[PDB]
Each structure stands twice: as structure tokens, then as C-alpha cells.
Design a protein around this nucleic acid. Structure first.
Lengths: 195, 110, 49, 48
DNA sequence: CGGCAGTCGCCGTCTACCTCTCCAAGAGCAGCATGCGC
DNA sequence: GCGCATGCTGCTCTTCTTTGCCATCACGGCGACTGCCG
RNA sequence: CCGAAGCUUCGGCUUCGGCAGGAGAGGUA
């Protein structure tokens, strides 16, 4: 398996980090198998299946919400039937109101649960849509989720074998003229970074 | 109650096994650790009329031990005389990660 | 302290009713520490006569 | 340090050409990287 | 976005000569050799 | 008389780093950097 | 490279044998 020369990555400064435009902490995380990175993301198919998967994810979210509705329905119905067959006739209606409050707390719990699942799917969508090369993706769960749903288009892994791919698919000239353009018309500290 | 992995030195897989096994009973935790299996294969060392079938550990140094995730369970498991430490640095290396159940079943094919 | 750590770790892997003080005690760490102090040390110096 | 590098490389080769799960291979690759780093410059990262 | 100040790591710290001592071991895995039992 | 069991003995590695062990280390100059406040 | 032993035509030829790293402490100018 490929490895990385220590001289060109753990220095002051980091020459590999200066060439690849990455913080040294990110390089240390990628190299020592603690986080993922996206080597390349196809922009053609993605730019069409964008709307395609938009439709698909709308469908999915609808399904999710409807399943929530159905579970709610079932549980609520049963609970209410039970509490209606007996409005705590031994004391007062207030004991039935209290068990109904418990039931509504349960309802709100399930609500929050489903809502959080909805926003996690939202997060998924967000991350998958705006995805560019050189974007550290931590959390193995998220990575595997993305590689399950939209496993095509984007590619990436961790380790020095995943940095060999970034270096191999690198164009020196475009970055050189980009840096020269930044130095030509710029100020602040971005000029110092470009220098 | 998922199947986790652990790391031992070298040749200490069965010493680690016995140690953990007995400890779980003596230390009193017969409700978190449940099953321990050390994957092993086979090597035909026939001496032209004298078979052997010696231990050929497919994964030397790795003992997969099912364990309910807690804190004292982690203590007893990792501090058993012989184990170097846990596996699963996926998230920097804070907590172990449960081995993919399908991968566990495929490991337990034999 | 090293011998105490060893005996504490070994007290939970042996079987009861066969545990005796002579089987729980290891002498090697103590003699190793003593012979490391009296030999390769910066304060036990060769005498000048 | 050469013996360490050779041992880790041999274990990695045998584990890769066996159908091992991904977690164990990643652990072995990290350990090999650390061993090579210690060969070229001992003490720069982590402990000597 | 945009300054901003603490902070954290890495670099360096004179030349030549003399004498002495000390520098992983126990655990483990086979491989038999002979004694004891049926 | 033969098979099984247990002790001399070749014989080649093996020695981590958690909820642990470990205890610290000057002093000045320089440069990135990095969370933090505005 | 040194030693031992033979042939030696006196240029030499043949046999055998043989090695030297680190850490710490104290001292002189």
C-alpha cells in the first residue's frame, strides 16, 4: 500500500498542504485513517439527475411523512378509543384529561422523532447536492448513507491511496495562473497567502 | 449486543480467550459479554504418513468478541491481561464501531 | 507497585480454593528495580580511592 | 526499524490476499504508515 | 467577512584530551523420550 | 508389549499505549494559525 | 593489511590463520 514521505507533510510549513490547499489537521486526519475525502465528483450526470433525484427525494419525503401520519393515526385511534370507553367515571374527567396529556406527550415525542429524521434526510440532500472535490466528510454513517443512495457520480476514500488520486488528477498551470490573478488584483491577507 | 473486534499481541489470542472467559465470570459481568470466537483455518502438515492439522489463525492478533456497549464492559474487556486495545478509529478513535453484521455472518461461515 | 499490579490482575483469573500467598507473589520486578538502581544509575557512583 | 517495516508489510500482504474486512485492513495500513514514518524520522509525530 | 492576539512548535546554545562501568529475559510453541498403565 | 502422558529441550519470535502510566525541561527568536470577538 | 608454512628461476607463486558499536559518571588545560 502506498505511504507518504514524512519530510513533505510534517514540516514548517507543509509543502503538501501548500500544494493541495489543505489545512495540516485535515491532511493528518485523512492520512491516518480518521476521516474521508471526496477525490472527484462528476458534474454532468449529477447536473441532470439533480432535478431527477429532486423529484425522487420529494417522493421519498412524502412517503416518510405519510408513514408518520399512519403510525400516528393507528396509535392515537387506539388510545382514544380506550380513554373514551371510560372517562375516569370513578373520580372526575380530569384524570382522563391527565392520561390524555400523557398520550399527547407521547404524540409529540413521535412527532419530534419523525421531524428529526426529516431534517436528517434534508442534511443528506444538502451535502450530496453541493459537493466539490477536496471536502473532508467526517462521520462514517453519513458517508455510507451517501454511498448507498447516490453511490455513483461522486468518488472518494481515505488513506494515502486517496491522496495519490488527488495529486495525479492535478493541473499545475491553471492554479498557477489563478494565483497570479489573485496576486495581481488583491489585498488583505489573501495576497500574503498567494505569495 | 453487536460483534466488536479487539487486538492482542501475537500468539496471545487463546490466552486472551481463556483470560476474558474466566474473568467475565469472576469479575461478574455475565450480562454484557456473550460470545467469543477466534477465527481459525487449517494447514495440511502431513509428514508422509503423520497428519497434524495445526492452528492457522486467519487473522493473527484480532479476536472478535460480542459485547454490549457500556463503560465498565469496556473496562473489563480492554484491561484483560493480554489485549493491546480496541479497533475502530473510524471516528478518530474515541469509541469502537460495531462490525457490519453481514460481515460478521460471512466471517462466521466456518 | 509493579508486583501489586501483577497480583491484582492475576487474582481474578485463578480458581478459588487453590489460591495461596506463594502463588500470587512475583519477585522479578523488585529484584530488577534494585539491580537497575545499584548498577546503571547516575547517583550510585564508582568510588575514587 | 527495517524488521518492523518488513513484518508489517508481510502481514498486510497476507491479510489483503485473504478477503479480510475493511476495518482490519485499515488498521494494518495505518500501522504500516506509522512504522515507515518512524523509520524515516523517529519522534517527529507521536511518541518515539 | 475581518481583524486579532495568544499560542504552540521548531531552531540554536566553544575546542582538544584522560579514566571507569554496563548493554531483555521470561513466556510460549512445538518435538520428542521415557515412565506408567492396561 | 504397546499406547498415552508429562517433562528436558530445540527454537524462534515478542515486547501495546485506555477509563493507564508519567514526571518533568531553560531561554530567546521566529513564524504560522486558529479559535475568538467584533 | 599482519603472521605461520612450502616452491622459489629471486620477478614473485601457493596453503592456512585473523577484527574494533552506544549510554552514563568523574577529571586536566
Amino acid at each position: 500500500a502506498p505511504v507518504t514521505h514524512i519530510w513533505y507533510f510534517k514540516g514548517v510549513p507543509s509543502r503538501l498542504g501548500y500544494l493541495l490547499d489543505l489545512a495540516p489537521k485535515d491532511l493528518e486526519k485523512i492520512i491516518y485513517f480518521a476521516a474521508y475525502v471526496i477525490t472527484s465528483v462528476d458534474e454532468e450526470m449529477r447536473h441532470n439527475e439533480l432535478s431527477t433525484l429532486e423529484a425522487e427525494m420529494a417522493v421519498e419525503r412524502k412517503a416518510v411523512e405519510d408513514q408518520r401520519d399512519g403510525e400516528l393515526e393507528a396509535r392515537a385511534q387506539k388510545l382514544e378509543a380506550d380513554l373514551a370507553e371510560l372517562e375516569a367515571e370513578g373520580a372526575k374527567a380530569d384524570a382522563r384529561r391527565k392520561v390524555r396529556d400523557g398520550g399527547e406527550r407521547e404524540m409529540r415525542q413521535i412527532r419530534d422523532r419523525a421531524q428529526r429524521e426529516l431534517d436528517r434526510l434534508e442534511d443528506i440532500w444538502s451535502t450530496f447536492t453541493k459537493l466539490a472535490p477536496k471536502q473532508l466528510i467526517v462521520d462514517e454513517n453519513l458517508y455510507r448513507e451517501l454511498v448507498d443512495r447516490y453511490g455513483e457520480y461522486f468518488t472518494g476514500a481515505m488513506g494515502a491511496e486517496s491522496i495519490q488520486k488527488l495529486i495525479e488528477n492535478f493541473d499545475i498551470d491553471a492554479e498557477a495562473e489563478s494565483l497570479r490573478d489573485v496576486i495581481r488584483n488583491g489585498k488583505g491577507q489573501k495576497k500574503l497567502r498567494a505569495l | 449486543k453487536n460483534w466488536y473486534v479487539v487486538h492482542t499481541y501475537s500468539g496471545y489470542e487463546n490466552k486472551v480467550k481463556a483470560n476474558l472467559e474466566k474473568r467475565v465470570e469472576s469479575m461478574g459481568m455475565q450480562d454484557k459479554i456473550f460470545r467469543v470466537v477466534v477465527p481459525e483455518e487449517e494447514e495440511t502438515d502431513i509428514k508422509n504418513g503423520k497428519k497434524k492439522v495445526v492452528k492457522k489463525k486467519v487473522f493473527p492478533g484480532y479476536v472478535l468478541v460480542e459485547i454490549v456497549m457500556t463503560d465498565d464492559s469496556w473496562y473489563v474487556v480492554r484491561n484483560t491481561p493480554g489485549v493491546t486495545g480496541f479497533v475502530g478509529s473510524a471516528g478518530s478513535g474515541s469509541k469502537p464501531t460495531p462490525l457490519l453484521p453481514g460481515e460478521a455472518e460471512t466471517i462466521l461461515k466456518r | 507497585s509493579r508486583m501489586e499490579r501483577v497480583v491484582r490482575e492475576r487474582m481474578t483469573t485463578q480458581d478459588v480454593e487453590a489460591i495461596t500467598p506463594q502463588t500470587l507473589i512475583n519477585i522479578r520486578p523488585v529484584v530488577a528495580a534494585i539491580k537497575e538502581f545499584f548498577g546503571t544509575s547516575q547517583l550510585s557512583q564508582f568510588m575514587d580511592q | 526499524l527495517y524488521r518492523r517495516v518488513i513484518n508489517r508489510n508481510n502481514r498486510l500482504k497476507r491479510l489483503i490476499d485473504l478477503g479480510a474486512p475493511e476495518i482490519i485492513v485499515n488498521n494494518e495500513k495505518r500501522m504500516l504508515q506509522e512504522s515507515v514514518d518512524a523509520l524515516f524520522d523517529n519522534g517527529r509525530r507521536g511518541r518515539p
